[PDB]
């Protein structure tokens, strides 16, 4: 959120990241993916990226906590990390 007046060259600030370990619990191997995500990333995009990694449809998948708590995807990844930590499940 620092305003750069004249950035003609297109320099970008790389944002702080949060990491999630996401397990596909419908597969008996319990495969997991660890995603490193810029903090402001909408959680909808994390769901999409995870679903693509597991080759399941994003439209019919949801991410929940390891305690079974639903996660409103209309939130930033940073806020999801602060509230729920890193250990998440992807499910139908």
UniProtKB/Swiss-Prot annotation:
It is found in: Nucleus; Cytoplasm. Coiled coil: none annotated. UFM1 precursor is cleaved by UFSP1, promoting its maturation: processing of the C-terminal Ser-Cys dipeptide is required to expose its C-terminal conserved Gly residue. CDD domains: Ubl_UFM1. GO terms for biological process: brain development; negative regulation of apoptotic process; negative regulation of protein import into nucleus; protein K69-linked ufmylation; protein ufmylation; regulation of intracellular estrogen receptor signaling pathway; response to endoplasmic reticulum stress; reticulophagy. One of its GO terms (cellular component) is cytoplasm. Belongs to the UFM1 family. This is Ubiquitin-fold modifier 1. It comes from Homo sapiens. The lineage of its organism: Eukaryota, Metazoa, Chordata, Craniata, Vertebrata. The gene is UFM1.
